[PDB]
Amino acid sequence: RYDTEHLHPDLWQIFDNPVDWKEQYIHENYSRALEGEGIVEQPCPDVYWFPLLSEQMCDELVAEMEHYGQWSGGRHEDSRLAGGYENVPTVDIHMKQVGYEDQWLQLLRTYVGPMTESLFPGYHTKARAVMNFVVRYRPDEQPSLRPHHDSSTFTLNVALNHKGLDYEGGGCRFLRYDCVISSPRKGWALLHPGRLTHYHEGLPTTWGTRYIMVSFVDP
Amino acid sequence: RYDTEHLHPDLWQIFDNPVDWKEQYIHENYSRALEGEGIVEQPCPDVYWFPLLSEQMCDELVAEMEHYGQWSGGRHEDSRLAGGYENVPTVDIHMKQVGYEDQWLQLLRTYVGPMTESLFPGYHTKARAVMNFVVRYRPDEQPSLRPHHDSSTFTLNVALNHKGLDYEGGGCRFLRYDCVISSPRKGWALLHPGRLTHYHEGLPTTWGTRYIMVSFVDP
Ligand SMILES: *[C@@H]1O[C@H](CO)[C@@H](O)[C@H](O)[C@H]1NC(C)=O
Ligand SMILES: *[C@@H]1O[C@H](CO)[C@@H](O)[C@H](O)[C@H]1NC(C)=O
Ligand SMILES: O=C(O)CCC(=O)C(=O)O
Ligand SMILES: O=C(O)CCC(=O)C(=O)O
Ligand SMILES: [Fe+2]
Ligand SMILES: [Fe+2]
């Protein structure tokens, strides 16, 4: 079976050919970081920084999302949420709309799980997530966010383009530690608990556009 | 109204005379610690140490619990839990059995709430808890616990007697920070997130008996 009615049909091949999918899309340094020979960094207390996705997957995902066009989001009230009201709105494209939800859940179950288990000993995960999306930060439509918390055990923050080449902005700023992240990488992922002890707030961007992929795993 | 069929009837007076109850049982240094002139300590990352209860309440509660006598607990399976199986058993007396549950929830809603809001800015609490109990650590019946996590946003750990005068043991040991708590005080309370980033394990006791009050608030 092979669905050809896609811009980039190979992205949906995580269920038929896992091995070739891993070789092509997953970052080449992921295995070394998992086995524990460095790579993974802790710039600030209890936040981790490891590579997950290569350049092909980032580019392909960004192009596929931009092909959708309907960049919903911005209003305080919501229609995609059962409650019907957002605490803080952003322009986002949830994966349920584009059909990539199940494959993303499979990726979370397969690759993110074991590493976050090794990073935090004594924690057992099922990688069950409900909210996962991609946000677009542009100086024209909407600026960065106000300080807030998250409704999850921990959050995964993956970038999807290069800093300086296509945008000039910043990452995250932690209020309780005066920690500022300056230059996030392209395929690297950020891990941090997001319920109690991490009062973070994203920095504003002034030039160009930037892409970020978020997923509130273990709600 | 006044129920006299109790060993110490004044403990149930948190609903009729809040002011006198506060003057008699609540620690005299609580207000200063809440207003922020020191007192509250942070011996290890993201764990706090503030006074809550005076000596009268600790003694009165310990005597009232010991009057109950039926120190249940010890078996891996459970009957007080809907699931019917404990991850780790301890000899405990849940407050539902002694009837002090509602007053304890009122105390959590009134006094613990505002302080844990000031301690962690940007966090809003309702102080809704389900599991809260008192454990007895004796070298004969059961030793200390194996490393574990907790099923709550954060836990409150209040001691109920003096170290050295009545027992010779230890407090908590954090695996992810090599943090050891040596001498917990009598009326002081311990606050720490207990889901993801705090892999703690209690120390063993060799001489005498020690009492601890725990409450898994915000499950
Ligand atoms: C993987 O890590 C090696 C470290 O020796 C580095 O040279 C290489 O550029 C990395 N691959 C990337 C960043 O795609
Ligand atoms: C309250 O704090 C003061 C600090 O000046 C101390 O002298 C006093 O003993 C404390 N009360 C206690 C420990 O009951
Ligand atoms: O962009 C950031 O650093 C903040 C984004 C964030 O935490 C969120 O989108 O929930
Ligand atoms: O004895 C202690 O201080 C740790 C016990 C504890 O937190 C627990 O038993 O869950
Ligand atoms: Fe967040
Ligand atoms: Fe605990």
Beta strand segments in chain B, E? 41-44, 47-51, 129-137, 154-159, 167-168, 172-174, 179-180, 188-193, 200-202, 207-208, 210-217
Give me the amino acid identity at B106: Q
Between strands B154-159 and B210-217, the pairing is antiparallel
**Contact of A38 with A94, CB cutoff 8 Å:** no
The residue whose CA has the least distance to atom 11 of ligand 1 is A29
Q: How far apart are CA B37 and CA B217, in angstroms?
A: 26
Residues in A touching B149 (Cβ below 8 Å): 122-123
Q: Check if A177 contacts B (Cβ < 8 Å).
A: no
Q: Check if B195 contacts A (Cβ < 8 Å).
A: yes
PDB experimental method: cryo-EM
Q: How far apart are CA B138 and CA B212, in angstroms?
A: 12
Q: Which residue has the tokens 């000031």?
A: B118
Q: How far apart are CA B126 and CA A146, in angstroms?
A: 23
The closest alpha carbon to A200, from A145, A137, A163, belongs to A145
Q: How far apart are CA B160 and CA B134, in angstroms?
A: 9
Three-class DSSP labels, chain A: CCCCCCCCHHHHCCCCCHHHHHHHHECCCHHHHHHCCCCCEEEECCEEEEECECHHHHHHHHHHHHHHCCCCCCCCECCCCCCCECCCCCCECCHHHHCCHHHHHHHHHHHHHHHHHHHCCCCCCCCCEEEEEEEEEECCCECCCCCECCCCCEEEEEECCCCCCCEECCCEEECCCCEECCCCCCCEEEEEECCCCCCEEECCCCEECEEEEEEEECC
**Contact of B51 with B39, CB cutoff 8 Å:** yes
**DSSP H or E run through B111:** none
Q: To probe the interface with A, which of B48, B148, B197, B216 has the most A CB atoms within 10 Å?
A: B197
Q: Check if B219 contacts A (Cβ < 8 Å).
A: no
Residues in A touching B123 (Cβ below 8 Å): 149, 196
**DSSP H or E run through B75:** none
